[PDB]
Amino acid sequence: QSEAEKARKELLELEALSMAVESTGTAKAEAESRAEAARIEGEGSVLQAK
Amino acid sequence: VDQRTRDALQRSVQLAIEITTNSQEAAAKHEAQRLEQEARGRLERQKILD
């Protein structure tokens, strides 16, 4: 079980990076889509006010 | 001189064989358990390494 845990430490190291990528991708996508839609609505509202 | 005394001594040697056979069966059983444990211990490391 000591050697099994020595390898399992490395697996748990790699799953950390996988979970980091899988969380930051969802966060970045859902943020940037709403930022782009807000930019479109603002640039529209300038012309609508004119 | 007695026949009964001779009969009591054959039952003394019909158990000295069983001591040896039960001993070799116990030694083989311990070796089988040790090998099954070593096989399991390498397979369990190989799964995490995969």
From Swiss-Prot, chain A:
Record's note on what induces expression: Up-regulated by IFNG/IFN-gamma.
Cross-link (Glycyl lysine isopeptide (Lys-Gly) (interchain with G-Cter in SUMO2)): K9
Post-translational modification: Phosphorylated on Tyr residues after EGF stimulation.
Compartments reported by the entry: Cytoplasm; Nucleus, Nuclear pore complex; Cytoplasm, Perinuclear region
Tissue specificity of this protein: Present in most normal tissues. Higher expression observed in epithelial cells with secretory and excretory functions, as well as in cells chronically exposed to xenobiotics, such as bronchial cells and cells lining the intestine. Overexpressed in many multidrug-resistant cancer cells.
Domain of life: Eukaryota
Function: Required for normal vault structure. Vaults are multi-subunit structures that may act as scaffolds for proteins involved in signal transduction. Vaults may also play a role in nucleo-cytoplasmic transport. Down-regulates IFNG-mediated STAT1 signaling and subsequent activation of JAK. Down-regulates SRC activity and signaling through MAP kinases.
Record remark: domains: MVP 3 mediates interaction with PTEN.
Subunit-structure text: The vault ribonucleoprotein particle is a huge (400 A x 670 A) cage structure of 12.9 MDa. It consists of a dimer of half-vaults, with each half-vault comprising 39 identical major vault protein (MVP) chains, PARP4 and one or more vault RNAs (vRNAs). Interacts with TEP1. Interacts with PTEN and activated MAPK1. The phosphorylated protein interacts with the SH2 domains of PTPN11 and SRC. Interacts with APEX1. May interact with ZNF540.
Protein name: Major vault protein
Organism for this UniProt entry: Homo sapiens
Gene, per the UniProt record: MVP
Residues of the full protein shown: 696 to 745 of 893
